[PDB]
Design a protein around this ligand. Sequence first.
Ligand code: HEC
Ligand code: HEC
Lengths: 126, 126
Amino acid sequence: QFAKPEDAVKYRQSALTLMASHFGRMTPVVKGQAPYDAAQIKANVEVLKTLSALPWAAFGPGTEGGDARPEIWSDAASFKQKQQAFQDNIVKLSAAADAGDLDKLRAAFGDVGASCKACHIAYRKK
Amino acid sequence: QFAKPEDAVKYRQSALTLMASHFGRMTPVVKGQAPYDAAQIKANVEVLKTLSALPWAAFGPGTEGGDARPEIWSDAASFKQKQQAFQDNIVKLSAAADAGDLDKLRAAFGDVGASCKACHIAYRKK
Ligand code: HEC
Ligand code: HEC
């Protein structure tokens, strides 16, 4: 869907921005600094689930650019492993949110965050 | 969810970027220049539906900025009318996509596009 590689970069940056907001806005709730409304979080995590499936298709072949390291393309199977693993951690977070289980939510949220941090150290430029 | 008004601007620009890609990538299909796969479009419009609900909450009070005209805030009810109307046009597009009806899709797509163009002329700076 991208006319030029630059369009893919702008799409993925925007998808990751949104994904990041929908994940990060739950930090005060996980820490107990904001109230836990199970329905609010269930709906939020549904949005996060949709958004979390979007960036990866905008790292197609030849879409080098942005703050992306070149290792995303040469190590196709390893990058793919990390996105699919991240998405599976999102499934766990969805299950916790759907259950309205705060403890399960907190644990899953930490696992998701670790997946974010790992793909970052590996596949994002300084 | 925004620490500063700037964060709201970056969120909404990113949401609108994504919304725009998910709408615009269907143009070749509506025009017959690309094949119509009803399942592909149904899934795409489901993504568009989720994305189309996101920008508006990032035009909260005092989030003036970006390429947004100031009339968004002073005419709160009118801007709100236009987003809710846009979202209702998205419901129509979803119904057409779910039905796998190409003619219905094309008509709905034009109505959605007109809603985009109108909010633009009114609420977006040159
Ligand atoms: C690899 C499989 C990743 C996972 C999982 C996550 N992110 Fe990431 N992110 C990744 C790359 C390769 C990039 C650079 C994209 C580019 O082309 O520039 C990014 C970028 C971000 C950004 C910045 C987006 C921008 O506006 O430019 C943010 C804020 C971000 N990533 C956050 C983030 C979070 C919070 C994640 C888990 C919820 C996460 N990313 C996962 C690669 C990967
Ligand atoms: C009013 C209710 C709008 C509707 C409906 C749509 N858009 Fe719009 N869009 C609107 C505003 C006020 C802005 C400016 C936001 C800012 O603070 O800068 C925009 C912006 C865009 C952009 C640019 C995003 C960016 O990266 O900065 C695009 C590409 C865009 N809008 C496209 C678009 C399309 C295709 C729409 C229908 C599917 C659409 N917008 C609806 C206001 C409104």
